Ligand binder design. Structure first.
Ligand SMILES: Nc1ncnc2c1ncn2[C@@H]1O[C@H](CSCCCCNCc2cccc(-c3ccc(Cl)cc3)c2)[C@@H](O)[C@H]1O
Ligand SMILES: [Zn+2]
Length: 617
């Protein structure tokens, strides 16, 4: 997490300018400059405050390992005389004879901000600090933040929050899978969706409002963690369906507002060429979509408690954070909603099924919260068994079956799919085991090989000449140059003249690369192939190999992903779709390196784990 904090020169330079100005304001009134730095991490901002002329710094860090690093970094840079590191939560910190501080500080520095601004406890930390740790009449860096909101319509972003009608073409015309009405009514998951709006095509949404300033936090004055709401009257820039609130904040480092960072996306700033990349923006969903009309004014309401923000449109006439009362939002993350609502993807799976559905086939469907079972039945399966391994998921799938009048056409088995019995299949044999494959708990692409393990575990229940779908799957890699993402894992070593070197097999990281532009240096190479049609070989699959770097640029990482061979005539990619183009529904794995790259990759059968190394050569 704290590798990103150092690579952000714009953040560091602005904190440094704020700290110089805030220490000078205090020294110039003839006063002792006493710094309280809540969330010191490395101590960088405490080291800045001393170079600026602060008399002492009290640097608070709750995470022991970081506290201990901060102690060593302060010593190496020569600041131990003027910086005391305290390993506690700021709310446990006291002023007194047996206290952490001898007296209240008069310069308050923090970096307790996430994408939502208040999600890392800034409101309660600042509250406790003004109450107990800081003088009235005190400098704060940052001085003030402001949260902005922009109302939009976005089929694509609304497809992260709602189940749409799903179409399949049967022999006897086109069929429609409709969503349970309670989904349509749900406010959705009571949590922010944090995205790089800079990578959203301006075609994917229509702006309905100006950028509205919704509220400000003044860090120099007493701050409340109390629930509040802020209403802004606005004039719709156009007519359409109010669906999504795009949000971001800016900070001012000084009382005059001269020193400023903003998280604003490209289209809300004056010059795209002056943009400074961040490791971003918020996407919220209105609890109901509703039409707005050009010229015809409405009131957008920002709500917040001590950690959470949420949005409503005030009724024309005319508060707990609403929660999911439909189940779906607790089982399906935003990407998964988007994935299920991709009609081209459903069409591609439909055509795969028309192929491998021999007359009177007996389908077992394996994949969490999957619509394949409904497609299978609509396309002429004799009988459909499906596995849902949680009660919540069992109940949601039964609910979707019921409202589509298929409650007696599809059997849900509520077990771990590998532990399935002959009686769960009503003594019938499976002619067609099928899946996406998708499982809720899969973090890396190959975790979905759990499908293959299940296929192995249930061999004895498969009819002779049983077809599997996917029939096979392959691990693919490509070496890439990242526009920006390298900074997430690239040691700083020197940070504004301060030495943080003490801060600066390898597990591949999952990342939604549709949000992180990059270009291919190698050609894409198939690394391992998995034959689902057969059991898992109980001996590890290895594969040494070479990838020739054919266009120039810093070889930043190997991007790994799955492809699934559905039928012989049909394949689908969770990685490259044809700057690299990435399937926006799945996370790809990145191996960070640290005229050719060489690899050892090994798949382990007892686990599904894959160990790998990528060395330049
Ligand atoms: N109350 C606490 N007391 C003591 N330690 C405490 C307390 N809370 C927390 N921590 C510690 O503070 C430390 C920090 S937390 C927060 C985790 C990192 C979040 N940045 C990531 C990020 C994303 C997006 C934007 C920005 C950004 C951009 C510009 C500007 Cl100008 C300012 C910020 C930053 C950790 O080391 C915690 O362990
Ligand atoms: Zn819900």
């Amino acid at each position: 997490s704290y590798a990103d904090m150092l690579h952000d020169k714009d953040r560091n330079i602005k904190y440094y300018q704020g700290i110089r100005a805030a220490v000078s304001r205090v020294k110039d009134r003839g006063q002792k400059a006493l710094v309280l730095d809540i969330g010191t991490g490395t101590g960088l901002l405490s080291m800045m405050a001393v170079t600026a002329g602060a008399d002492f710094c009290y640097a608070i860090e709750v995470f022991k390992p970081m506290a201990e690093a901060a102690v060593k970094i302060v010593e190496r840079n020569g600041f131990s005389d003027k910086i005391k590191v305290i390993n506690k939560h700021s709310t446990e910190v006291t002023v007194g004879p047996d206290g952490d501080l001898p007296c209240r500080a008069n310069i308050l520095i923090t970096e307790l901000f996430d994408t939502e601004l208040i999600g890392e406890g800034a409101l309660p930390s600042y509250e406790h600090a003004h109450k107990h740790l800081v003088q009235e009449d005190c400098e704060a860096v940052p001085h003030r933040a402001t949260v902005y909101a922009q109302l939009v319509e976005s089929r694509r972003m609304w497809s992260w929050n709602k189940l749409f009608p799903v179409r399949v073409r049967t022999s006897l015309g086109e069929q429609v899978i409709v969503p349970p009405s309670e989904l349509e009514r749900c406010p959705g998951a009571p949590s922010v969706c944090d995205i790089q709006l800079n990578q959203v095509s301006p075609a994917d949404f229509t702006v309905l409002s100006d950028v509205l300033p919704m509220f400000s936090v003044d860090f120099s004055k007493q701050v409340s963690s109390s629930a509040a709401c802020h209403s802004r009257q606005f004039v719709p820039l156009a007519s359409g369906q109010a669906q999504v609130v795009l949000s971001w904040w800016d900070i001012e480092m000084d009382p005059e507002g001269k020193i400023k960072c903003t998280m604003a996306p490209f289209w809300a700033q004056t010059d795209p060429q002056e943009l400074q990349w961040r490791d971003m923006q918020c996407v919220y969903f209105l609890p109901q979509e509703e039409p707005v009309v050009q010229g015809s004014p409405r009131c957008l309401v920002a709500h917040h408690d001590d950690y959470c923000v949420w949005y409503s449109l005030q009724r024309t006439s005319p508060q707990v954070r609403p929660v999911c009362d439909c189940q779906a939002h607790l089982l399906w993350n935003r990407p998964r909603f988007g994935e299920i609502n991709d009609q081209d993807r459903t069409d591609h799976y439909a055509q795969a099924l028309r192929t491998v559905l021999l007359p009177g086939s007996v389908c077992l469907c394996v994949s969490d919260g999957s619509l394949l079972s409904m497609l299978a039945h609509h396309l002429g399966a004799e009988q459909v068994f499906t596995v849902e391994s949680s009660v919540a998921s069992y109940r949601l799938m039964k609910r979707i079956f019921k409202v589509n009048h298929l409650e007696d056409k599809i059997s849900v088995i509520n077990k771990r799919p590998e532990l399935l019995t002959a009686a769960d299949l009503e003594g019938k044999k499976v002619s067609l085991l099928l899946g996406e494959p998708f499982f809720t708990t899969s973090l890396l692409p190959w975790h979905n090989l759990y499908f293959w393990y299940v296929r192995t575990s249930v061999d004895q229940h498969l009819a002779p000449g049983a077809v599997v779908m996917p029939q096979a799957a392959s691990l693919h890699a490509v070496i890439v140059e990242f526009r920006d993402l390298w900074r997430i894992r690239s040691p700083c070593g020197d940070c504004e003249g301060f030495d943080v070197h003490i801060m600066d097999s390898r597990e591949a990281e999952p990342h939604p690369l549709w949000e992180y532009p990059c270009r291919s240096l190698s050609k894409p190479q198939e690394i391992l192939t998995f034959d689902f049609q057969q059991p898992i070989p109980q001996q590890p699959m290895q594969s040494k190999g070479t990838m020739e770097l054919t266009r120039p640029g810093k070889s930043h990482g190997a991007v790994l992903w799955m492809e699934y061979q559905l039928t012989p005539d049909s394949t689908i990619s969770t990685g490259l779709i044809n700057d690299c183009c990435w399937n926006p529904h799945c996370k790809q794995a990145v191996y960070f390196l640290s005229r050719s790259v060489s690899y050892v990759v090994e798949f382990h059968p007892l686990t599904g784990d894959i160990t790998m190394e990528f060395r330049l050569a």
